Design a protein around this ligand. Structure first.
Ligand SMILES: CC(=O)N[C@@H](Cc1ccccc1Cl)C(=O)N1CCC[C@]12C=C[C@@H]1CC[C@@H](C(=O)N3CC[C@@H]4C=C[C@H]5CC[C@@H](C(N)=O)N5C(=O)[C@H]43)N1C2=O
Ligand SMILES: CC(=O)N[C@@H](Cc1ccccc1Cl)C(=O)N1CCC[C@]12C=C[C@@H]1CC[C@@H](C(=O)N3CC[C@@H]4C=C[C@H]5CC[C@@H](C(N)=O)N5C(=O)[C@H]43)N1C2=O
Length: 113
Protein backbone atom coordinates (compact mmCIF):
# COMPACT_ATOMS: atom_id res chain seq x y z
CA UNK A 1 0.00 0.00 0.00
CA UNK A 2 0.85 3.70 0.06
CA UNK A 3 3.06 5.42 2.63
CA UNK A 4 0.14 7.55 3.92
CA UNK A 5 -1.21 4.44 5.70
CA UNK A 6 0.90 3.75 8.74
CA UNK A 7 0.92 1.13 11.47
CA UNK A 8 0.26 2.65 14.87
CA UNK A 9 0.30 -0.60 16.82
CA UNK A 10 1.35 -4.21 16.44
CA UNK A 11 0.47 -7.09 18.77
CA UNK A 12 0.58 -10.88 18.77
CA UNK A 13 -2.85 -12.55 18.94
CA UNK A 14 -4.70 -15.53 17.56
CA UNK A 15 -7.60 -14.17 15.50
CA UNK A 16 -10.97 -15.89 15.83
CA UNK A 17 -14.43 -15.30 14.45
CA UNK A 18 -17.73 -16.43 15.94
CA UNK A 19 -19.58 -19.07 13.96
CA UNK A 20 -23.09 -17.76 14.48
CA UNK A 21 -24.69 -20.97 13.23
CA UNK A 22 -22.76 -23.40 15.44
CA UNK A 23 -22.35 -21.06 18.43
CA UNK A 24 -18.58 -21.60 18.57
CA UNK A 25 -15.41 -19.54 18.02
CA UNK A 26 -13.34 -20.66 15.02
CA UNK A 27 -9.92 -19.58 13.74
CA UNK A 28 -9.95 -16.78 11.23
CA UNK A 29 -8.62 -18.15 7.97
CA UNK A 30 -9.26 -21.75 9.01
CA UNK A 31 -6.24 -22.68 11.18
CA UNK A 32 -5.54 -21.86 14.81
CA UNK A 33 -2.34 -19.97 15.45
CA UNK A 34 -0.90 -16.63 16.29
CA UNK A 35 -0.86 -13.64 13.98
CA UNK A 36 0.85 -10.30 13.94
CA UNK A 37 -2.05 -7.84 14.17
CA UNK A 38 -1.65 -4.17 13.22
CA UNK A 39 -3.91 -1.18 13.54
CA UNK A 40 -3.24 0.90 10.43
CA UNK A 41 -4.12 4.57 10.30
CA UNK A 42 -4.81 5.89 6.82
CA UNK A 43 -3.89 9.50 7.38
CA UNK A 44 -5.43 10.63 4.08
CA UNK A 45 -9.04 10.16 5.18
CA UNK A 46 -8.39 9.57 8.89
CA UNK A 47 -9.68 6.02 8.85
CA UNK A 48 -8.35 2.94 10.61
CA UNK A 49 -8.27 -0.80 9.90
CA UNK A 50 -7.07 -3.98 11.61
CA UNK A 51 -4.96 -6.35 9.50
CA UNK A 52 -3.53 -9.57 10.89
CA UNK A 53 -1.25 -12.09 9.23
CA UNK A 54 -0.31 -15.50 10.57
CA UNK A 55 3.22 -15.49 11.91
CA UNK A 56 4.16 -18.87 10.56
CA UNK A 57 3.05 -18.31 6.93
CA UNK A 58 1.72 -14.72 6.55
CA UNK A 59 -1.82 -15.81 5.59
CA UNK A 60 -3.99 -12.71 5.87
CA UNK A 61 -6.66 -13.71 8.38
CA UNK A 62 -8.33 -10.36 9.16
CA UNK A 63 -8.64 -7.15 7.19
CA UNK A 64 -11.46 -5.09 8.62
CA UNK A 65 -12.36 -1.47 8.87
CA UNK A 66 -12.60 0.26 12.23
CA UNK A 67 -15.47 2.72 11.77
CA UNK A 68 -16.29 5.68 13.93
CA UNK A 69 -18.16 4.52 16.99
CA UNK A 70 -17.04 0.92 16.92
CA UNK A 71 -17.65 -0.84 20.24
CA UNK A 72 -14.52 -2.68 21.45
CA UNK A 73 -15.06 -5.10 24.32
CA UNK A 74 -12.42 -6.38 26.69
CA UNK A 75 -14.04 -9.64 27.68
CA UNK A 76 -11.04 -10.95 29.61
CA UNK A 77 -7.52 -9.71 30.26
CA UNK A 78 -6.33 -11.53 27.12
CA UNK A 79 -9.47 -11.88 24.93
CA UNK A 80 -10.98 -8.82 23.26
CA UNK A 81 -13.74 -8.68 20.65
CA UNK A 82 -15.70 -6.41 18.29
CA UNK A 83 -18.32 -6.68 15.57
CA UNK A 84 -19.07 -5.70 12.09
CA UNK A 85 -22.16 -6.65 10.10
CA UNK A 86 -20.48 -9.76 8.75
CA UNK A 87 -18.59 -11.26 11.70
CA UNK A 88 -17.73 -10.97 15.35
CA UNK A 89 -13.94 -10.94 15.73
CA UNK A 90 -12.01 -12.06 18.75
CA UNK A 91 -8.32 -11.67 19.55
CA UNK A 92 -6.70 -14.12 21.94
CA UNK A 93 -3.58 -12.15 22.80
CA UNK A 94 -0.22 -13.76 23.45
CA UNK A 95 0.23 -11.82 26.68
CA UNK A 96 -1.51 -9.26 28.84
CA UNK A 97 0.84 -6.56 27.54
CA UNK A 98 -0.07 -7.38 23.94
CA UNK A 99 -3.74 -7.06 24.86
CA UNK A 100 -3.43 -3.87 26.86
CA UNK A 101 -1.26 -2.02 24.33
CA UNK A 102 -3.57 -3.04 21.46
CA UNK A 103 -6.65 -1.94 23.41
CA UNK A 104 -5.08 1.42 24.28
CA UNK A 105 -4.25 2.01 20.61
CA UNK A 106 -7.79 1.04 19.64
CA UNK A 107 -9.23 3.46 22.21
CA UNK A 108 -6.90 6.24 21.00
CA UNK A 109 -8.07 5.52 17.45
CA UNK A 110 -11.71 5.70 18.44
CA UNK A 111 -11.03 9.16 19.91
CA UNK A 112 -9.13 10.34 16.81
CA UNK A 113 -11.90 9.28 14.42
C1 LIG B 1 4.02 -4.85 7.93
C2 LIG B 1 3.93 -3.53 7.17
O1 LIG B 1 2.89 -2.88 7.15
N1 LIG B 1 5.06 -3.17 6.55
C3 LIG B 1 5.16 -1.91 5.81
C4 LIG B 1 5.95 -0.97 6.72
C5 LIG B 1 5.84 0.49 6.26
C6 LIG B 1 6.88 1.03 5.52
C7 LIG B 1 6.82 2.35 5.09
C8 LIG B 1 5.72 3.13 5.41
C9 LIG B 1 4.67 2.59 6.15
C10 LIG B 1 4.73 1.27 6.59
CL1 LIG B 1 3.37 0.62 7.55
C11 LIG B 1 5.92 -2.14 4.48
O2 LIG B 1 7.07 -2.55 4.51
N2 LIG B 1 5.27 -1.89 3.32
C12 LIG B 1 5.99 -2.07 2.03
C13 LIG B 1 5.28 -1.07 1.12
C14 LIG B 1 3.88 -1.51 1.44
C15 LIG B 1 3.88 -1.37 2.95
C16 LIG B 1 3.82 -0.02 3.36
C17 LIG B 1 2.62 0.61 3.70
C18 LIG B 1 1.43 -0.10 3.60
C19 LIG B 1 0.45 0.14 4.76
C20 LIG B 1 -0.53 -0.92 4.36
C21 LIG B 1 0.39 -2.14 4.30
C22 LIG B 1 -0.23 -3.16 3.34
O3 LIG B 1 -0.22 -2.91 2.13
N3 LIG B 1 -0.77 -4.28 3.84
C23 LIG B 1 -0.88 -4.88 5.21
C24 LIG B 1 -0.87 -6.37 4.88
C25 LIG B 1 -1.96 -6.35 3.83
C26 LIG B 1 -2.11 -7.58 3.16
C27 LIG B 1 -2.28 -7.84 1.79
C28 LIG B 1 -2.35 -6.97 0.68
C29 LIG B 1 -3.39 -7.47 -0.32
C30 LIG B 1 -3.48 -6.21 -1.15
C31 LIG B 1 -3.82 -5.20 -0.03
C32 LIG B 1 -5.24 -5.39 0.52
N4 LIG B 1 -5.35 -6.08 1.65
O4 LIG B 1 -6.21 -4.89 -0.06
N5 LIG B 1 -2.81 -5.58 1.00
C33 LIG B 1 -2.35 -4.85 2.01
O5 LIG B 1 -2.86 -3.73 2.15
C34 LIG B 1 -1.36 -5.31 2.90
N6 LIG B 1 1.66 -1.56 3.74
C35 LIG B 1 2.83 -2.14 3.45
O6 LIG B 1 2.96 -3.35 3.61
C1 LIG C 1 -23.90 -7.03 22.44
C2 LIG C 1 -22.82 -7.87 21.79
O1 LIG C 1 -22.47 -7.61 20.63
N1 LIG C 1 -22.31 -8.83 22.61
C3 LIG C 1 -21.21 -9.73 22.15
C4 LIG C 1 -19.82 -9.34 22.74
C5 LIG C 1 -19.56 -7.85 22.52
C6 LIG C 1 -19.92 -7.01 23.55
C7 LIG C 1 -19.73 -5.66 23.38
C8 LIG C 1 -19.20 -5.13 22.21
C9 LIG C 1 -18.80 -5.97 21.18
C10 LIG C 1 -19.02 -7.34 21.35
CL1 LIG C 1 -18.55 -8.38 20.11
C11 LIG C 1 -21.47 -11.15 22.60
O2 LIG C 1 -21.91 -11.39 23.73
N2 LIG C 1 -21.11 -12.13 21.74
C12 LIG C 1 -20.52 -12.06 20.37
C13 LIG C 1 -19.85 -13.42 20.25
C14 LIG C 1 -20.92 -14.29 20.81
C15 LIG C 1 -21.23 -13.55 22.12
C16 LIG C 1 -22.50 -13.90 22.61
C17 LIG C 1 -22.68 -14.87 23.59
C18 LIG C 1 -21.59 -15.51 24.12
C19 LIG C 1 -21.68 -15.63 25.65
C20 LIG C 1 -20.30 -16.10 25.84
C21 LIG C 1 -19.56 -14.97 25.15
C22 LIG C 1 -18.25 -15.55 24.70
O3 LIG C 1 -18.20 -16.13 23.61
N3 LIG C 1 -17.24 -15.48 25.54
C23 LIG C 1 -17.15 -14.78 26.87
C24 LIG C 1 -15.66 -14.48 26.95
C25 LIG C 1 -15.17 -15.84 26.61
C26 LIG C 1 -13.78 -15.83 26.50
C27 LIG C 1 -12.99 -16.38 25.50
C28 LIG C 1 -13.36 -17.09 24.34
C29 LIG C 1 -12.34 -18.17 24.12
C30 LIG C 1 -13.10 -18.94 23.09
C31 LIG C 1 -14.41 -19.18 23.86
C32 LIG C 1 -14.22 -20.18 24.98
N4 LIG C 1 -14.30 -21.42 24.56
O4 LIG C 1 -14.06 -19.85 26.16
N5 LIG C 1 -14.67 -17.85 24.42
C33 LIG C 1 -15.80 -17.30 24.84
O5 LIG C 1 -16.81 -18.01 24.89
C34 LIG C 1 -15.86 -15.98 25.28
N6 LIG C 1 -20.43 -14.66 24.01
C35 LIG C 1 -20.27 -13.72 23.10
O6 LIG C 1 -19.27 -13.01 23.17
Amino acid sequence: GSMSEQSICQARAAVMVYDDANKKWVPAGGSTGFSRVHIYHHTGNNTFRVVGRKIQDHQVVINCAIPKGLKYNQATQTFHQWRDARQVYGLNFGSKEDANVFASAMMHALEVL
